[PDB]
Design a protein around this ligand. Structure first.
Ligand SMILES: CC(=O)N[C@H]1[C@@H](OP(=O)(O)OP(=O)(O)OC[C@H]2O[C@@H](n3ccc(=O)[nH]c3=O)[C@H](O)[C@@H]2O)O[C@H](CO)[C@@H](O)[C@@H]1O
Ligand SMILES: [Mg+2]
Length: 474
């Protein structure tokens, strides 16, 4: 739309003259490539103004009992009822899953997308394959429940970022989508945001003809859904329910019928899963009620005070007051998304920029890697839109952590959330399932239940009285 010079001028008017410090020494091709990159930034002056306001701008209680439920407390009949509602929805092609895999998992230090990571289970399955097989399995369980001739389809929308896209897609193709239909696995990229200097008023140059940019946070998912036509696809296919989740959880129950059934039974617009907080210092957001506006919301682990994090429950001193840990497992009604996404992406009121100090290798005038944080990355949080839902339309399901949540965040060597803790948890869960179904594991070993065999412990009646050894795959 605008000329090359018009773009340059709009950045200079926004006081970003440093970006053109080496412009004249660049070849014409590098210049054109540079401005093309700058042109993707919609409204520079406004963005910078917003980042600045965000920087110079930086009463909770527990959610009402009416909006919460726990799989630890519900009777089998109630859980079965929800399961059936969930399976029926799946059986009618009304369910889609949305996988957030745009993160670069810096803490883990892997060169490949976290989803490809191998926590070294006997099966050597990557996180992506486990999730793929969970999807295939639940489709089959729904088909069996409804007695369908063919299995229903759960479209799997995978949100990648520029840096994880190629490897991610190439990985699924090389593995033939792990058994799923190629058409049901749909990739789409989330956007990016420019990185700024510590002061937060200047965009950082990565190279002489390139600015630093990073994935705009999982909160950038809503805009990516609209812009990539995913929302249109949901409507086109008649999908009514979508399960959004985090790629790092090796235990995740993708498209959990219990979770979907919970939302349908209660007619929720939005629902989220939580587990009991490990300890005051666990790096997890907490689901709470904002008493000032009487709206549900999440307080991120990095923006909570030690005092609030450590406060004990006044009605039970043995527990932390705020202990509903966010495990990034969200349910959204498609209708709710059709109605709200236009609003959410139209202002910071729902998706404010969160500031993160980072060590960003960039231009000094030469490229370099710092030892101290030299810039900031901007991020929108997926849950910041929660307050916009009506309290009575928001659900919070507490689940069993050992059965549903073991995140891979750190490289081996750390105390928690490592490939080892994930592997151990995965094997312990599998082993518990086998024992409960009468299976005998010799020499106190640990076995692995194949995701191709059981979704969550069901259909394991054949192991009763049967012997297994440490390392077996069932
Ligand atoms: C914002 C957010 O969700 N925070 C949650 C996240 O924290 P945490 O900081 O550990 O995780 P991240 O926000 O980095 O990643 C969450 C998920 O979003 C994806 N992602 C992230 C950034 C991005 O630009 N694009 C993208 O797709 C990641 O691939 C991952 O699947 O998990 C914790 C549990 O482990 C929760 O208690 C936190 O409340
Ligand atoms: Mg309750």
């Amino acid at each position: 739309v605008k000329s090359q010079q018009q773009i340059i001028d709009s950045f200079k008017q926004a006081n970003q003259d440093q970006l053109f410090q080496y412009y004249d020494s660049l070849t014409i091709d590098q210049q054109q490539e540079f401005i093309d990159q700058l042109s993707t930034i919609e409204e520079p002056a406004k963005l910078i103004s917003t980042v600045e306001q965000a920087i110079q701008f930086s009463n909770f209680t527990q959610l009402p009992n009416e909006q919460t439920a726990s799989t630890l407390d519900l009777s089998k009949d109630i859980l079965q009822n929800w399961t059936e509602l969930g399976l029926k929805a799946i059986g009618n092609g009304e369910v889609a899953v949305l996988l957030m895999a745009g993160g670069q998992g810096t803490r883990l230090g892997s060169s490949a997308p976290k989803g490809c990571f191998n926590i070294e289970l006997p099966s050597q399955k990557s996180l992506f394959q486990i999730q793929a097989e969970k999807i295939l399995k639940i489709e089959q369980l729904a088909q069996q429940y409804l007695k369908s001739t063919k299995k229903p389809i759960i479209n799997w929308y995978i949100m990648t970022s520029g840096p994880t896209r190629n490897a991610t897609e190439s990985f699924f193709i090389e593995n033939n989508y792990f058994g799923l239909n190629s058409h049901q696995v749909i990739f789409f990229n989330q956007g990016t945001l420019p990185c700024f200097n510590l002061q937060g008023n200047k965009i950082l140059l990565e190279l002489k003809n390139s600015i630093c940019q990073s994935p705009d946070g999982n909160g950038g998912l809503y805009k990516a859904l609209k812009d990539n036509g995913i929302l249109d696809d949901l409507n086109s296919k008649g999908i009514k329910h979508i399960h959004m989740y985090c790629v790092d959880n090796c235990l995740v129950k993708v498209a959990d019928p219990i979770f979907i059934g919970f939302a349908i039974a209660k007619k929720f617009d939005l629902a989220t899963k939580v587990v009991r907080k490990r300890d005051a210092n666990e790096s997890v957001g907490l689901i709470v009620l904002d008493q000032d506006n009487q709206k549900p919301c999440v307080i991120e682990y990095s923006e909570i005070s030690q005092e609030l994090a450590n406060k004990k429950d006044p009605q039970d001193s043995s527990k932390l007051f705020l202990r509903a840990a966010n495990i990034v497992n969200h349910y959204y009604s498609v209708e709710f998304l059709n109605k709200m996404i236009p609003k959410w992406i139209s202002s910071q009121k729902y998706l404010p920029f969160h500031i993160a100090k980072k060590k960003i290798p960039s231009l000094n005038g030469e490229f370099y890697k710092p030892t101290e944080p030299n810039g900031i990355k901007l991020e929108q949080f997926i849950f910041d839109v929660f307050p916009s839902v009506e309290l009575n339309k928001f659900g919070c399901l507490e689940v069993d952590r050992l059965d549903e949540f073991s995140p891979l965040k750190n490289a081996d060597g750390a105390k928690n959330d490592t490939p080892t803790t994930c592997r151990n948890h995965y094997l312990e869960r599998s082993s518990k399932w086998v024992i409960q179904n009468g299976g005998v594991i010799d020499n106190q070993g640990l076995v692995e239940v194949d995701s191709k065999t059981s979704y969550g412990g069901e259909g394991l009646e054949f192991v009763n009285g049967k012997h297994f050894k440490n390392g077996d795959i069932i």
